[PDB]
Structure formats: structure tokens, C-alpha cells
Design an enzyme around this catalytic site. Sequence first.
Site, PDB file in Angstrom:
ATOM      1  N   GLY A 188      -2.879   4.494   1.375  1.00 51.33           N
ATOM      2  CA  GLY A 188      -3.556   3.993   0.185  1.00 51.33           C
ATOM      3  C   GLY A 188      -4.594   2.927   0.501  1.00 51.33           C
ATOM      4  O   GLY A 188      -5.477   2.655  -0.310  1.00 51.33           O
ATOM      5  N   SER A 202       0.846  -1.186   0.000  1.00 53.74           N
ATOM      6  CA  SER A 202       0.000   0.000   0.000  1.00 53.74           C
ATOM      7  C   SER A 202       0.887   1.243   0.000  1.00 53.74           C
ATOM      8  O   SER A 202       1.958   1.264   0.647  1.00 53.74           O
ATOM      9  CB  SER A 202      -0.925   0.026   1.226  1.00 53.74           C
ATOM     10  OG  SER A 202      -0.212   0.303   2.421  1.00 53.74           O
ATOM     11  N   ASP A 203       0.447   2.276  -0.717  1.00 51.09           N
ATOM     12  CA  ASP A 203       1.013   3.589  -0.487  1.00 51.09           C
ATOM     13  C   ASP A 203       0.596   3.962   0.940  1.00 51.09           C
ATOM     14  O   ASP A 203      -0.283   3.320   1.532  1.00 51.09           O
ATOM     15  CB  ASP A 203       0.559   4.627  -1.522  1.00 51.09           C
ATOM     16  CG  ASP A 203       1.594   5.729  -1.733  1.00 51.09           C
ATOM     17  OD1 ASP A 203       2.332   6.044  -0.773  1.00 51.09           O
ATOM     18  OD2 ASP A 203       1.674   6.277  -2.850  1.00 51.09           O
ATOM     19  N   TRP A 204       1.257   4.967   1.495  1.00 52.86           N
ATOM     20  CA  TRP A 204       1.114   5.294   2.903  1.00 52.86           C
ATOM     21  C   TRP A 204      -0.212   6.057   3.031  1.00 52.86           C
ATOM     22  O   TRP A 204      -0.279   7.268   2.789  1.00 52.86           O
ATOM     23  CB  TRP A 204       2.285   6.149   3.385  1.00 52.86           C
ATOM     24  CG  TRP A 204       3.597   5.449   3.802  1.00 52.86           C
ATOM     25  CD1 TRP A 204       4.411   5.848   4.819  1.00 52.86           C
ATOM     26  CD2 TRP A 204       4.239   4.290   3.220  1.00 52.86           C
ATOM     27  NE1 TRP A 204       5.514   5.035   4.909  1.00 52.86           N
ATOM     28  CE2 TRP A 204       5.431   4.067   3.949  1.00 52.86           C
ATOM     29  CE3 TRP A 204       3.941   3.435   2.153  1.00 52.86           C
ATOM     30  CZ2 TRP A 204       6.312   3.026   3.650  1.00 52.86           C
ATOM     31  CZ3 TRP A 204       4.818   2.392   1.865  1.00 52.86           C
ATOM     32  CH2 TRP A 204       5.984   2.197   2.611  1.00 52.86           C
TER      33      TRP A 204
END
Lengths: 202, 761
Positions: free
Chosen positions: B260, B256-258
Site C-alpha cells: 500500500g 500500510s497494507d502489504w
Amino acid sequence: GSASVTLLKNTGSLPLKHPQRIAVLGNDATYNVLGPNACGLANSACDIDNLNGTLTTGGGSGSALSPYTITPLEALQKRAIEDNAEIAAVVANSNTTTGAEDAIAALLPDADVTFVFLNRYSEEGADAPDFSLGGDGDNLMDLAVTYSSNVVVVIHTTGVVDIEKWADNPNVTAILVAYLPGQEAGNSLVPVLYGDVAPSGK
Amino acid sequence: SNSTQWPAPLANGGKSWASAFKKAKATVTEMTVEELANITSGVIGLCSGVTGAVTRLGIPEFCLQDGPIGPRGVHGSSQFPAGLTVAATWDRTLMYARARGMGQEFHDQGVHLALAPVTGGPLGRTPLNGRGWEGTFADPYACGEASYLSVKGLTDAGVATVSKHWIAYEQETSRNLYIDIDGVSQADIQLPISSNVDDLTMHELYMWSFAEAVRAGTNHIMCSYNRINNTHSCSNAKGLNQLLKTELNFQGGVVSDWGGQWDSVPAAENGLDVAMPGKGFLGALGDFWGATLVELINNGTVSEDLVRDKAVRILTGYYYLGQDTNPPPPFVYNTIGAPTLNATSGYRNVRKPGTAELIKEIGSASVTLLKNTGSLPLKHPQRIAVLGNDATYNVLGPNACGLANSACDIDNLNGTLTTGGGSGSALSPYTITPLEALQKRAIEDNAEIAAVVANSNTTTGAEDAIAALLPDADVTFVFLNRYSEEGADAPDFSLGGDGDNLMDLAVTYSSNVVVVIHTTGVVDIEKWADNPNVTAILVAYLPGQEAGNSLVPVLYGDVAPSGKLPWTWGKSIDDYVPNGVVYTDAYSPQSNFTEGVFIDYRWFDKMGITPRYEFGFGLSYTTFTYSNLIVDHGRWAKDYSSVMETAEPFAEWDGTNSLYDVIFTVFATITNTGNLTGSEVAQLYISIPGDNQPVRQLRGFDKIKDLPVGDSAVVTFPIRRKDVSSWSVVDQLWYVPNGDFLISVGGSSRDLPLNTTWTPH
Ligand SMILES: *[C@@H]1O[C@H](CO)[C@@H](O[C@@H]2O[C@H](CO)[C@@H](O[C@@H]3O[C@H](CO[C@H]4O[C@H](CO)[C@@H](O)[C@H](O[C@H]5O[C@H](CO)[C@@H](O)[C@H](O)[C@@H]5O)[C@@H]4O)[C@@H](O)[C@H](O[C@H]4O[C@H](CO)[C@@H](O)[C@H](O)[C@@H]4O[C@H]4O[C@H](CO)[C@@H](O)[C@H](O)[C@@H]4O)[C@@H]3O)[C@H](O)[C@H]2NC(C)=O)[C@H](O)[C@H]1NC(C)=O
Ligand SMILES: *[C@@H]1O[C@H](CO)[C@@H](O[C@@H]2O[C@H](CO)[C@@H](O[C@H]3O[C@H](CO)[C@@H](O)[C@H](O[C@H]4O[C@H](CO)[C@@H](O)[C@H](O)[C@@H]4O[C@H]4O[C@H](CO)[C@@H](O)[C@H](O)[C@@H]4O[C@H]4O[C@H](CO)[C@@H](O)[C@H](O)[C@@H]4O)[C@@H]3O)[C@H](O)[C@H]2NC(C)=O)[C@H](O)[C@H]1NC(C)=O
Ligand SMILES: *[C@@H]1O[C@H](CO)[C@@H](O[C@@H]2O[C@H](CO)[C@@H](O[C@H]3O[C@H](CO)[C@@H](O)[C@H](O)[C@@H]3O)[C@H](O)[C@H]2NC(C)=O)[C@H](O)[C@H]1NC(C)=O
Ligand SMILES: *[C@@H]1O[C@H](CO)[C@@H](O[C@@H]2O[C@H](CO)[C@@H](O)[C@H](O)[C@H]2NC(C)=O)[C@H](O)[C@H]1NC(C)=O
Ligand SMILES: *[C@@H]1O[C@H](CO)[C@@H](O)[C@H](O)[C@H]1NC(C)=O
Ligand SMILES: *[C@@H]1O[C@H](CO)[C@@H](O)[C@H](O)[C@H]1NC(C)=O
Ligand SMILES: *[C@@H]1O[C@H](CO)[C@@H](O)[C@H](O)[C@H]1NC(C)=O
Ligand SMILES: *[C@@H]1O[C@H](CO)[C@@H](O)[C@H](O)[C@H]1NC(C)=O
């Protein structure tokens, strides 16, 4: 320059060996922000608060133009790169530039050495009112000794200045006066700082 | 959304990671539920992200560290040029070496996973994108090639890559990462921009680069902040489970993006493998797995096996790169920052001999000459004037703007723009300023040199200093910049700081003005580009630490400029793809990619709009004449080379073959017909026949090095089956269409002296 730069105090911080994290403070370490000859034919027509850079000469009829200035920062950086080190300079006005105090606070604690470059411009047609340092010199020193324990002071000056607030500070490990060294300011100084030649000026 | 329609296939280890998968199964098979949730979610640490250890089984915490120019927030490293800058070299050797060097600095700083490269997200759709600079080319093919070599360099150093951002992440505005601190939740204010993308566009434009990243063997992929068709990328089943994990046959982990990750359960089912940051960042960006996934698994909502496949994907990279038997050292820097993390830093010097010289070389290979009326190369000018704070240091120090190069005051004089703002930045051990390098050369010529490096509008006497200095100067350099950052798009093409005013003053007082632009993208130079007082214009992108010493040898003609534009330089923002960035307060913001494949030069070519400087344009100090175009259909070869294989379906499959087999090779000859040695980037474009098809698509580039006056060189372009194919929406497969393919070759996208026709079946 190398023969005149005068070592006034040294508790053992000089000469430098191969320090890996180097901090620099003061507009005196770099160029006049308007150019080396911006102050005009007599080096005396820049605004009162202008960051004039390295004080390589004084004001008035006994000044002269400069084809360049070899700044202390340039010469310090060159040597830093030879040692595979990092170097950073805060060269703004420490009182009036947004974020300058915080930048100094964040920079100095991890540096192995921090250099503060001070100056004191004076000129023909007026006398100095007192021995006070030019520009933000007082404030640079106050900040430097707050955030570092290996402060090396270099003064480009037309005469005696007031360093009484800091000269006996245990965090000021060395002090030098380099007077008015002309265009070769950085490259005359750095070889003394790093011990290539021992200082011999008095 | 529908993970019954789009089910999650199991990791098997694919081509190159078979032994690594086998180890990963074995270790994962022995893990408790407690332990599966520990490694699958982030924890508090000094790195951008840290996975939880499985400490019973000897499996340590993985350091996940930014970013695409090298380890961020770290002392004792080098500041590399950005991806935009290597792109401008058009030099595959430099693309690989750049990443291989970043790689060694990553590993030697103690990093397991590099949050890099940017491999086609953003690509991008708008030239205002805040972080477009982190990528490379605005072109699927060239981005694909540089993506492959970037992943390859990083993996060859022993650092696992997390290629980002999957996918259609084409604006920073309303990307709206999930935050939920005290009361205020992002769920309550605005959902992330939804990129609404048709099947063809997704296949022919945005997936192309990620397909190359997968083939180079990216260990992981980051899912992006944007929604796609109104479903979050990190819980899009069509996206992660089908397109990436089935069609691209991706055997690694989706991180995951931070912020996301917005769901717990949809994410777990729809393709996400790692939750970041987890307990990092005060748990503020969501903590949707961890103990919550512990509960969700042993109460029956989320399958145990499903979550075991996640941990297998994570551990495959660990074993493939030999991090078990050759562990990286401890990571010693606090890169998060107080007050979010109160923790001290140690120190480690990781700069190897050769790195500084490589970075210099990338700068000299990338700086792009856009205008030359004959002032360049310089001879031995005796009086030199320099304009612009960009010519010298950040007045508060190179790293004053903090761990993400973005915390300096809006009006601060940041010096030379050597990198951009955000998580893609990095600290710098020094900056070799343009002024330093110019002065060194002036001194060698017994010349004089003076720079005005203050803000020309707000500093007392600055305008008068400029007016007095310039008239007598033999040459006047103007250094301009335009900072942009992650988390916002540029509002327009305007220059940063006092750039406009510097140019107005410069053209007023000097008739030999040489302009040098350090920038994260296209800027507006329309006022002055046709002013004959401006004798030369160069764009230097973001050169990293060796800014000045890369530039000056080009200016003085020790090396001919050789870079070319990796995107289109249009005269106005209005000439680009419409709705490039959508600004709205609506709860569910929408971006419809109705343009389809037509971004950057494809848009310009289809709509018949002339740019100022086209895609693939850059001058030299000499000229190249093209001749003797040859299509060799006998020069074919089987795809053996790739680290991993995709499972992209295609019409011509027969058991034997691949979409990436090279099916022919085209050749051409260049001759240096000017009066100086020069390098030339030759380019190959193909018009694939069909309906609503681009006028031209880049399918090859080859840079000839230092071709002497009068000499010739053969330029070589392998053409893959995929390079000549279209995506069929009806049949859901790639196919080589029928009709006439025009194959075009020359020095830019609009300077193509050689053409021929190829007609297949
Ligand atoms: C975000 O949103 C978009 C928009 O909804 C999604 O895009 C859609 O993606 C799906 C794939 O998941 C596409 O479905 C396929 O459609 C095929 C028929 O296409 C026609 O359908 C409608 C007509 O009303 C139109 O949308 C299409 O028009 C578009 O394309 C044409 C051609 O380029 C353009 O000219 C138009 O302007 C439009 O842009 C089409 O006219 C359909 O055949 C296909 O079905 C096969 O595949 C599925 C899945 O594998 C099988 O289950 C099924 O059985 C079929 O396969 C059989 O047949 C083939 C041979 O024919 C064999 O090879 C197989 O073995 C098998 O026996 C499928 O349903 C949809 O068309 C597409 N729409 C658009 C507008 O792009 C994005 O995916 C979505 N993205 C995300 C990330 O969620
Ligand atoms: C960068 O470089 C810049 C230049 O390029 C620097 O700017 C210059 O900085 C200097 C000081 O550093 C500054 O000096 C003058 O400032 C004003 C300008 O108008 C003057 O008042 C000052 O002169 C007076 O003060 C001196 C000390 O007190 C004194 O020695 C001098 O003689 C003079 O005092 C007389 O004038 C007063 C009347 O108002 C009386 O009270 C006083 O007693 C003296 O009286 C005598 O003269 C009178 C005639 O006026 C007469 O009435 C009386 O009877 C008696 O005879 C001071 O020199 C420069 O102006 C400044 N230049 C510019 C253009 O601004 C800059 O500082 C540098 N930067 C940095 C960071 O250092
Ligand atoms: C779940 O993840 C936790 C965080 O990663 C983990 O706790 C951490 O365990 C490691 C051991 O792998 C400890 O690391 C160090 O411990 C001592 C410290 O003096 C050193 O001698 C070791 O060499 C080692 O580097 C961490 O201290 C520890 N962190 C915390 C906050 O406790 C859990 O153990 C993991 N739980 C399970 C069940 O796997
Ligand atoms: C120097 O860099 C700083 C950031 O380090 C720039 O300030 C930001 O500029 C953007 C617009 O691009 C604003 O939206 C941000 O709010 C600014 N940040 C802060 C903390 O103020 C600054 O503009 C740069 N200086 C120049 C002259 O371009
Ligand atoms: C000396 O420096 C340290 C920090 O390095 C500071 O805490 C201390 O107060 C300083 N002492 C003086 C007398 O300035
Ligand atoms: C299972 O655990 C989760 C997380 O604590 C909880 O929200 C959920 O309601 C539980 N039971 C279900 C889904 O039946
Ligand atoms: C070009 O520069 C000269 C001074 O060198 C000036 O007189 C002239 O107006 C300038 N022209 C333009 C078009 O900017
Ligand atoms: C985006 O897509 C649909 C067409 O399928 C349209 O109805 C919707 O209004 C579009 N949004 C905008 C903002 O144009």
C-alpha cells in the site's frame, strides 16, 4: 464388524492413544460420490472408475441396499473431536484429480498417524484377474509411505489382495483387513483402532 | 497531497492510553535513528508481518497476523464464522463473544497485532466485492455497531487490533498492490483504482464505522490499496493526517497494507506510521523505509520528531495492553509459505472448551430462512436425498487450498464453503459437514439418506443417479455454494461449480426441494426461487467449522431460524449502484462515487426498486406483531462508556456534551402471534430530513430471544445525537437538521408497521 476386523501387522502404533494430527487417504474412507445405492439393485452398475466409497459389500445378487453408510472418516473424525484433535482426508482419485498428489505431500509429513483405506471390489459373473488393489490403491500406498512414517492400512475387500510392495515397508506400522462390514463400517472399526476393544478376528 | 494544509498532529494518548503514551514517549525518546527505522518498517519473520525489535531497549519483534476470522496459517485453532455471518445474527452478544474468542486464540498463538477487524472497508458499494464477506453489514450504522464490539473483543483478549481498510476500499479489481520484482513494476502498468468521494459521502457513509472502531479503542488502522481523489490512501494527507488523525483524533498507528506504500517521503509526511511488509516477501512489495528512512532522516528531508511520533503510536498499543509485563508466547508457525520463506513449524493447540459451541451457536443464530411454503420445520422424514458437493468435504481435505484457502484448482470440489478465499481465511481442524449432521438425525428417526456429492455435469452416471434417487424422497436438500476471494471481484451473481445444473435436476425430479446456500454474497436464484417445487430457501453464509451441526437443528425445528439479511438481495445485478466495479486498462483507473450515500438498500429505496429479499429480511417459524411505539425524550444519557474519544466537530457542542450522547430512547412491543417459540430481530429506521436524503436509515436493532407463543417483550433503541445528524459541507461539522424525522420500527427495512414523527428545535 468389531469381532471380525483382523489385525495382520502391528509394530506398536496400535492401539491409538490420543493423537492430535490425523491424516486419512482413499475414497474408501468416505461415501460413494453418487450415493450408497447408486450402483443399482445388484451393486454392480456404476462406471468402472467411479469412486464407490467404503466397500461394505460386494457386487451381484448377494449384495443389498443400504439405508446409510457410517464411513470410516465420520467415525475417525468423531473420535478426533473427543481428543481435541485435527483430522483431514484426501478422498479423491490420487492419479486423475488435479492437485491430489501435492495435497497428499503437504498433508502427511506433520500427521502423527496416517490411515490409508484400500478396497478391492469383485462380483458375481467374473473372476478377479489378479490380486491387485482396486482403483488407485497402489498409488495411495506409494504416496503414503513416501510422505509418512506411521502408516496404518485398512482394507475393505472381497478377498486376498497384493500388498507385497508395502507390507515390509518400515513406514507401514499396522495393517488390518475389515472384509465387507455392511452399513456400520466406521463405528465397528474405530473402537478397535483406539483400543476400546482388542481386535480378535482371524 | 498537501501536508502543509493538512499537518500531522502529535499523539498524546487520548482518554484510555495516557499511561501507555507516557511509557511510549520515554522509550522512543531514548531510541537512535537506526532504531526508529527498525520498528517503523517490517522484517523477515513467521507472521504475516513483523516489526523490527529495539533490542537494546528490550522491545521485541511484534507479530502482525491475519485475519478477521482468527489467526491464519496456523494449526491448533478454530475456524470461526466470517463477519458476514455474525452480521446476520443481529446479536451484539455474539459479535463480542466471537471476537473475544478469536482474541484468545490470537494471543495464545503468540500474536501482538491482529490484522482485523474489517471495519467498513469494504462496506460495501458493490455486492460483487470479492472480500465483502470479511466485513459485516452493508450499512454504516450496523457495521459501526459490529465494528465496535469486534475491536472490543480483540482488545479485551490482550491483542492489539489493526482495523482495516481505511478507506473507500470498495473493489478488488485494479486495487493493484505495489510489486517490483526484477524488471516488472506495478508503477509501470497501472495505478490503483481511485475512489473519488465527496465530503458528505466520506463523512456520512465510509467514516461512520471507522469512527466506532476508534471509539472502541482500535490500537492501529490499516490504510488501503486504493487511491482516493488520485492520491494513495497510505499517503493521503487529507485522509490520514486530517480526517483520521485530527477529526477522529486517532492516537494509534497507521499500518500500510502489504504494498500500500508507493512513496518514501510523501508517506512519511502524510500520515503513515508503519511500513509492511518491509524485508518480508523478498522485499518485493516495496522496502521504502528501513535503511532508506535512516538516510532520509540524517540528510534532512524527513523530520526526526515526525518519525518519533510514528514509533510512539506503535509502542502505545504495546504498553496499553500490557504486552511488556505479560508478553504473548512465541509464534511457532510458518504462515508465509515456502518458497517465499523456508522455515519449519512447531505446534500448539489453542482450542479452548466453549469455542466449538459458540461457533455452532453463531451458525444457528445466523442461518436465514428466505422461503418457506410449509416444508420447514421438518418432522421425521423417512427417505432423504441430498445434492451437492457443498454437503460434504473438500475431496482433497479441508485445508487443501493452502494458507489462504485459494490455491485449489478452478474445478476442484471444495466441499462446504465454511469460509472465503484470501487473507481473511483460516485453517480448519475439521468440518462438520451438512451430510454428516443430516445423517445423524436420519439415523435417530430410523430413516434412510443418500447424497450425490460429485460434480453433476462432468461425472459419469451422476445425472442418472440423481434422477433415480429423487422421485421417492420425502425431502430433497440441495446444497449450493459460491466461492469468492480477495484480489478479484465476482463477475456476476452466478452459483459456483455445478449449482445451476443441480437446481435444474432437483426441480425436475422432486417437489419438496429445500435449498441451503453457503456463500460470500448474493447469488442468482431467479430460475428457481418462484418454482413451487422449491419449498424452502435458506442462506447460511460462511459458518466456519461447525457448518452442519449449526444448520440441522434449525431445519428440524429444535430452534427457530432467527437470522436476517445484512445486505439487499436484488433480482439482478443491474438493480444495484451503477459502476460497482470498473474494469479498464487506463493507467489511472477511476471510480466516481457519484451515488453518494446511496449504497445497498439506500439505493434500492431511493430508486423505487423492489429487491427479492430486502435488507434486514428473514423468516421465522412464527410471526411477530408490533405495537405501542414510544419515543421517550426523558431517557437521555451522557457518553461515558467509550475507550477513546474522537474530536468530531458538531453544532450543539457546549463544553458539556458529545456527538455520542444518547438524546432520546425509543421503545416498542412485539408479541409472538404465531404458534411456535421464536426470536425476533426488531429494527429501527429514521428518515432524517434534508435535501437528497435517504428514504430510511437504520439507527437501531434489538434481538428478543425465544419469545414464547402469546408472550410480549419490550424492544429498546437508544438514539445518539450523531444518529439524528447530518454533515454540513459548508460549516464542516455535524448538526441536527430542522424538519420532520419519521421514526419507523418493525421486522425488516420494508416491513415497518410502526411509525411516528419527531420535530426538534
Ligand atoms: C476528495 O474530493 C472532494 C471534492 O473535491 C473533497 O471534497 C471537498 O472537501 C472540502 C473539505 O476539505 C470541502 O471544502 C469546504 O467547502 C465549503 C463550501 O462548500 C461549497 O463549495 C463548492 C462550491 O463551488 C462545492 O464543492 C460545495 O458543494 C457540495 O456540497 C453541497 C452541500 O451539501 C452539495 O449540495 C453540492 O452538490 C456539492 O456536493 C459547496 O457548495 C467551505 O465553506 C469550507 O470552508 C470552511 O472550512 C475550511 C476547512 O476547515 C476553512 O478553512 C474555511 O475557512 C471554512 O471554515 C470557516 O467557516 C465556517 C462556517 O461557514 C466555520 O465553521 C469555520 O470556523 C471557518 O471560519 C470548505 O472549503 C468541499 O466543499 C468538498 N467538495 C465536495 C464536492 O464534497 C474531499 O474532501 C476529497 N477527499 C479527500 C480524502 O481528499
Ligand atoms: C466401483 O463399482 C463398479 C461397479 O458398480 C466397478 O465397475 C466394474 O468393475 C469390474 C471390475 O472391477 C468390471 O469387470 C468387467 O469389465 C469388463 C466389462 O465388459 C469385462 O471384460 C470383464 O470380464 C472379463 O474379465 C475377467 C478377468 O479377466 C473374467 O473373469 C471374466 O470372465 C471376463 O473374461 C472373459 O471375456 C473375455 C472376452 O473379451 C475373454 O478374453 C476372457 O478369457 C473371458 O472369456 C470368457 O467369456 C467370454 C464372454 O464374453 C467368452 O467369449 C469366452 O469364450 C469365455 O467364456 C470384467 O468382469 C465391470 O465391467 C465394471 N462395471 C462397469 C459398469 O463398468 C468399479 O471398478 C468400482 N470402482 C473401483 C475404483 O473399484
Ligand atoms: C533491528 O531488528 C532486527 C530484527 O527484529 C533485530 O535483530 C533481531 O534481534 C533479536 C533480539 O531482539 C533476535 O532474537 C533472538 O536472539 C536469540 C537467538 O538465539 C535469542 O536467544 C533471543 O531470545 C531472541 O529471541 C534476532 O535473532 C535478531 N534477528 C536477526 C535477523 O539478527 C536487530 O537487533 C534490531 N536492531 C536494533 C539496533 O534494534
Ligand atoms: C474451489 O476453490 C478454488 C480456489 O481454492 C477456486 O478456484 C479459483 O476460482 C476463481 C474464480 O472464483 C479463479 O479466478 C481462480 O483462478 C481459481 N484459482 C485457481 C488456483 O485455479 C475454485 O473455483 C473453487 N471451486 C468451485 C467449484 O467453486
Ligand atoms: C519412510 O518415510 C520417510 C518420510 O517420513 C521417507 O523419507 C522414507 O523414504 C520412507 N521410507 C520408505 C522405505 O518408504
Ligand atoms: C537523502 O537520502 C535519500 C535516500 O537515500 C536519497 O534518495 C536523497 O537523494 C538524499 N538527499 C536529498 C533528498 O537531498
Ligand atoms: C415439479 O416436480 C414434479 C415431479 O415431482 C415434476 O413433474 C414437475 O414438472 C416439476 N415442476 C416444476 C415447475 O419444476
Ligand atoms: C469522474 O469525475 C469527473 C467529474 O468531476 C469527470 O470529469 C470524470 O470524467 C469522471 N470519470 C468517469 C469515468 O466518469
